[PDB]
Write a protein that binds this ligand. Structure first.
Ligand SMILES: O=C(O)CNC(=O)C(=O)O
Ligand SMILES: [Cl-]
Ligand SMILES: [Mg+2]
Ligand SMILES: [Mg+2]
Ligand SMILES: [Mg+2]
Ligand SMILES: [Mn+2]
Lengths: 223, 20
């Protein structure tokens, strides 16, 4: 029965994995039935025109589409039609709360809303980037993939991560019911390689309390 | 060196963080 007990998965797998490698994959996170329900909720968001072009933290002159080709919407988890996405978010949060004080030196107190994202085939992807390069509070990226029948050799869409200090990169296929964690800072630059079929994923970013407070102070003072 | 914030995925700064 999935999801697995959070305490053991967090302390005996996620924590040591994250501290050693900065990247952790949990396959078959919620099971087929729940994963399919999430897929249907995501496809209904897509079908009803909720997605908008993905955006960047800062922009000068470049079109966002020369950088990221996905379309997204932000989900709080309590919206009608998003109940199973809410269960996913609650399950991610459960894991993080069982990791309190054990993920590096971070104190994780909060997170973003969920970013439901679609790369609509057609070779769309995301150029090599860092999720939080300049201290905006994000310390852990958590992604759930929902692509049933994804054949990455044909459809592409691999997330390639270049973890600092390793002799090989980490290729993450966007597999159905796969959960991924990685450090959001400069230790993990990464690319979404071009996707040739419709590719869905849901991301939440967890905040380190002290860094996020400093970032909010900068925003609220116009700096 | 490139300003990496121009490649980084947007998040709301203003009133939209969730407390755990
Ligand atoms: O969807 C993925 O596998 C990776 N997503 C990103 O890198 C992003 O949206 O910042
Ligand atoms: Cl929860
Ligand atoms: Mg611009
Ligand atoms: Mg925690
Ligand atoms: Mg709350
Ligand atoms: Mn990213």
């Amino acid at each position: 029965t999935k999801p697995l007990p959070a305490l053991k998965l967090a302390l005996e797998y996620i924590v040591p994995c994250m501290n050693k490698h900065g990247i952790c994959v949990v396959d078959d996170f919620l099971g087929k039935e729940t994963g399919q329900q999430i897929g249907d909720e995501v496809r209904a968001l897509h079908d009803t025109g909720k997605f908008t072009d993905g955006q960047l933290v800062s922009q000068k002159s470049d079109s966002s589409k020369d950088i990221r080709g996905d379309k997204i919407t932000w989900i709080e988890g309590k919206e009608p039609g998003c109940e199973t996405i809410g269960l996913l978010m609650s399950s991610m949060d459960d894991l993080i709360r069982h990791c309190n004080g054990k993920l590096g030196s971070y104190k994780i107190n909060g997170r973003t809303k969920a970013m439901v994202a679609c790369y609509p085939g057609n070779g769309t992807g995301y150029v090599r980037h860092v999720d939080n390069p300049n201290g905006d509070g994000r310390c852990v990226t958590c992604i759930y993939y929902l692509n049933k029948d994804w054949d990455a050799k044909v459809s592409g869409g691999i997330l390639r991560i270049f973890p600092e200090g390793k002799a090989q990169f980490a290729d993450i296929e966007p597999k159905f019911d796969r959960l991924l964690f990685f450090w959001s800072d400069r230790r993990n630059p990464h690319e979404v390689q071009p996707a040739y079929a419709t590719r869905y994923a849901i991301t939440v970013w967890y905040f380190d309390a002290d860094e996020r407070a400093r970032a909010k102070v900068k925003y609220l003072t116009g700096e | 060196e490139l300003d990496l914030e121009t490649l980084a995925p947007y998040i709301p700064m203003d009133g939209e963080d969730f407390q755990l």
